[PDB]
Amino acid sequence: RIIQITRGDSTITSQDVANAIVAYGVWPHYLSSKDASAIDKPSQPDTSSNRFYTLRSVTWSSSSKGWWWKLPDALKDMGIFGENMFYHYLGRSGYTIHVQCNASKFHQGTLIVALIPEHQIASALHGNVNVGYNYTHPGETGREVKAETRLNPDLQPTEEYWLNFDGTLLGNITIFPHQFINLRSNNSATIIAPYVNAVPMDSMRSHNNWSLVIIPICPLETSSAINTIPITISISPMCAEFSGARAKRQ
Amino acid sequence: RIIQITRGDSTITSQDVANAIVAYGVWPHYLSSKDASAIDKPSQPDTSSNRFYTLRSVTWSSSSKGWWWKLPDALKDMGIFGENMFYHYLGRSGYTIHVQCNASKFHQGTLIVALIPEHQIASALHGNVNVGYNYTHPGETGREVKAETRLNPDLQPTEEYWLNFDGTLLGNITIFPHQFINLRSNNSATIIAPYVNAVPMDSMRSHNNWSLVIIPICPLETSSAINTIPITISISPMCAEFSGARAKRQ
Amino acid sequence: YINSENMYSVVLQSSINAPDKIFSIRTDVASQPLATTLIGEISSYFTHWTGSLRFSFMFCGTANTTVKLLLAYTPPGIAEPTTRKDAMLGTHVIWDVGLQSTISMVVPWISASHYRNTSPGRSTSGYITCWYQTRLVIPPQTPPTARLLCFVSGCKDFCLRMARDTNLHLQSGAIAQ
Amino acid sequence: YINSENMYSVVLQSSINAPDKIFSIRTDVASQPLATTLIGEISSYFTHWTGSLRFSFMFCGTANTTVKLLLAYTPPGIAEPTTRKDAMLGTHVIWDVGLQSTISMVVPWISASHYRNTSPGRSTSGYITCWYQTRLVIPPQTPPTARLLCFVSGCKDFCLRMARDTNLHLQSGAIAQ
Amino acid sequence: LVVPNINSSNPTTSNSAPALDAAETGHTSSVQPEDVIETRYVQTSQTRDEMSLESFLGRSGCIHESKLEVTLANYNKENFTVWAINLQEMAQIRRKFELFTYTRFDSEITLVPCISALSQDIGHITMQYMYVPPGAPVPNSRDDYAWQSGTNASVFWQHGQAYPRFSLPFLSVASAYYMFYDGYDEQDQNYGTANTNNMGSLCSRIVTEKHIHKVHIMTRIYHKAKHVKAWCPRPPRALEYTRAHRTNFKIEDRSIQTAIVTRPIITTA
Amino acid sequence: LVVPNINSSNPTTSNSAPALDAAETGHTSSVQPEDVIETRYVQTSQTRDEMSLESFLGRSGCIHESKLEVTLANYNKENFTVWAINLQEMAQIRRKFELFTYTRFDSEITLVPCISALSQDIGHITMQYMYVPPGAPVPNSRDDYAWQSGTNASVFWQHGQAYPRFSLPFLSVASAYYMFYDGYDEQDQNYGTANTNNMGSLCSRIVTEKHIHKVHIMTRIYHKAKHVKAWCPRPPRALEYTRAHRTNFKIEDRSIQTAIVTRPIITTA
Amino acid sequence: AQVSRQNYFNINYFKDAASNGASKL
Amino acid sequence: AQVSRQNYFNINYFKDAASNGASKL
Amino acid sequence: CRIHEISCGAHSTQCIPVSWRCDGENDCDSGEDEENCGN
Ligand SMILES: CCCCCCCCCCCC(=O)O
Ligand SMILES: CCCCCCCCCCCC(=O)O
Ligand SMILES: [Ca+2]
Fold it and tell me: What stretches pass through the bilayer (chains A, B)?
């Protein structure tokens, strides 16, 4: 019923949880001498990167509809992991995702935390339109579900959470690695994911292997004074690897 | 009579040299489980740092008197080695220093390349005066021997090369790891140095274990059109190690 | 609070919705405010020290009150962290209050030399900042504030040396018999 | 030249066609100008010495510049040699510059007693004169001068004894704290 | 006496939480570095020898300064001192021992005479120090018979003789000395260590017969503990000491002053 | 510890030239007598024992002169000294140790008191010397409690007592003492050995109570190194020392003066 | 009798308990 | 224990490391 | 600071005995102990 995770110089705890789930059931690990293509000695920053990085908390209220960050990226400023990420062309990693969010025996709500591989969103417009880089690489902030016009907005991803942002129905979202946070029960979710992608290593900049999604499937109701609780996200890379080292790109 | 050094994704060559010399005769290496004090897993960036970094060439003329850079520091901007250096409190490393400088069978000159441990310069003034941080941390540029007044100049290191910048006489400079570049013979020097210091690891910012020095002991004379040749410096860390990881300092 | 228990606890607010600093302190065993503590006072009897420290925290709010803090240790060589991000990039622990009130975490010994001075100068051994990971939360009809205590002790690691006279206690003028 | 590198090198002329002296110095390790050197300074910390000395020379002229010198050691008991003949009648070495810039030669320990005084009086341990065996020579379009450095060190032989206070360094009036 | 070493640790992700405990018990959460951070492997050398009780109280310190003023005229009727024995009179020391409830040990006493000259010359001075146990007769004149010392232990010091010194076995009629004592008299009075720690008195007296120079003798007393044991540690002292054998601390029109420094705000130290 | 002997040599006429080498390498051409002169055969006795580090720094020298002037009037408020500990203050010594970058060793300290009389007589003087580590409370009056020395190490000297002396273990929190140090503060300030070599301070104070004679106490301090090791030799010093923990040498309106003597011409020495 | 520390001899010259030097551990 | 030099006895009378005389080689 | 012996060549501070009166060494801070001598 309890839990304690350690990574690098960091350690999470949680007095009450639903026993962490392992992505597709395959613990992370380094790159096999039998698969790699990169023919140069990979760098493994170790404890200085495979640590726990905590994001920028967002707020959940009686009207929020959802959020999401893409991985890697989101970490692009988090120390060495961040740096390395740009100093090299190729990178590979799997991580541990701990989503915390306490409340009270006098609340009620329910969030769906889902980790998704190759999450290709769809712009919210008709005709030949795509999505703009800048909008799918927010950063530690994330992208919120806001209903109220944007900018050079035709490069904007749709704002239709209930369709998982892609033409599928939330409700089949479970087919991916996911946990549920149900205030009346737990108060934190935890996902550990290996490296998934059809190639040894990929470019940390031009592609986000994953994509974290959180959707309140159940209205956050209460009678208490606090009717707005924060939701925090902490992430820790595992077995980080970089190749093709050169200059830092901007 | 030839030579070829490889490090990381880099490789130096030199059609003609005086067989490289090893600092105090002890090849570099990592930190012994029996000495360390840092009780946390060190990070070893490997090939992404233990590579060859080339500086910013300075110019030698019929009147230059000398130059010098301090180590680490000098590298503080050179990719990952650079970054890591600031992201952590503690760092440890030894490097390979290759000083190149070709000329012609029709020249003559002679440089003294010396690597020095704990090189404590002396300000060029009388009375209670010290040296200012900013002046002993130039960067990839170095500090040249310029005779012509400075700024808030009472925090300035002396400009007396012939006294090794410290009250000793150049000429006993040899007591340290050093090679000679004598245009009529070689055209490059090479020093490989281990980590020297009275403690496991030290702060990369607040202290420069080494200090490279170059002094023309022999006037660069010639009859040719080119009467000014450049001198370049390339450096490569070896067995880099960092500890106490936190935020990047400015 | 200076001369009352209230100096020993801290106060958490149910009205703070954001990454706010709560408190912090230097590490150097013989520093302020550690110096007055058991370990502290004693360390103050020697000159050099070395080891890991064990910081424990106990939440005292109501039984239905819940939170999620973040005790963090930022290694010397820099400056006190101003933001949460800036802080958690070091050694830390996301502590979630639930049933067990306590939670101990450790400040690894991470120095350049093997030993350090009891009495520092301008030097430091890092700081321990503490922030709001989530937010204090309560139900209806409950004290909007909660207390948070803090203990310290040395690990199996810890150790002192160099006997010298304590500085945290003096005698100005004779004592009556 | 006194306070510049130029004191450490010597100059050879392409315009001197004959047996001309170039330079010379006493031998006695703690003499002038040796005294300021590594070995020297240290010897200056004792009273008695004994051993053979290793003098090395490095030519710095152009790569096409060539010469033929003559380093010579004239045993004490006489006077500095004025002519080449007079000089080479002792221990010497005809060094020819070609590819290898260096050339080391030795000053055998040749005394009456087993040890000698660091600080001599009017006594000597011989001199090292240096002459033009041939003549510096160059092609067209080249610096008519070349530099010549000089190093010294002790042999497997060498050895000191009788600890005493150095004379090459003083302290007139207090030092500031 | 060694300290264990630190073992290398690895990224756990278990159901058991050693970090999480409960201080309500009264136990010191037994958590070690490893359990909380992928740690290294270190072969510690460190030694706790110095931190032994025997090394702590094993150092000599001062416990008393006995100033004696010589008086020409009535020579034999004064020029002598007395002293209620105890450690309670000198912070430094006292603070330490007062770090444990009970303690047992033998003692090494060392004397330090200083003759402050008052005439142009000192002449020939000679002191005597007698240990008078509780029950023995106290001297009352530079010439009292008691100074015969047919049984008490006296030690003589003359000018130009190196500091004297002697050893003392653990006195007391108990298993150990009382550093503190929540008890009273058989006449419900004198709450305090004074109730017991009656070791007698220490007296001195210039021996040199009537003479010509007025002078001042200042003999300091140092004490080192040996062969030690101590029980039940207590929290250390926090305020200047005021009186012997009592804890009292409130002082004549002055604030209660600790050693805890103050600060402006807690989000910056 | 012996020196090899010299073997007999013979007229070579080989294709190999050991005499010819290249100093560009940075190596000291390894040539020996034999290789260059039909030499004799000698059975050398010579020994390098004396040239051992332990024989070199193995000699006691002076590192500090602490003059204390006694002042009748305000006795208890002065008549005491302080001292920033270090070797940096006395050329002789300093020059030597400053011959290596790092060094490790234990120390033998020896004191030398001299009482310069100012009245017709001296009376009875008694000094005290306390070692106050960095962090410990510094004295501030000939009567400060600190001189109780419940833990610091003090040594007492009185007139007519032979020079005192004591031994000291290698201090520092490192593997060795820093003779030099190209580094700064955590507040980018104080470039220099001062940045580290903080050993605390050494204080004295006349003990003899208020008296009649004005006098001057001059206590010199000598130091011998024991059990030694040193690393990375450096070139020796060349100019008078000016200030502690700094290399500086330029002095107030005076030429840069070495020890190298000048001559008229190089073809005659 | 003589021992090892942090060799050397040391017998107690005195006939009594207390006179002895410092204890061992 | 006693040895040879450049015989004689010498035991360390002191209980501590530093107090010892000069080292050997 | 008199007693017919000890006396600084100054209006204030401490006092220097008669032995250092126009002797060549400067004892009192003011330097007046060595001012206008040479008789
Ligand atoms: C003759 C010298 C006297 C020294 C006596 C030492 C006795 C210490 C007993 C402790 C009693 C106390 O609590 O003060
Ligand atoms: C109590 C006597 C004091 C003697 C202390 C010797 C310490 C030498 C350490 C060297 C520090 C320095 O570089 O000056
Ligand atoms: Ca005078």
Answer: none
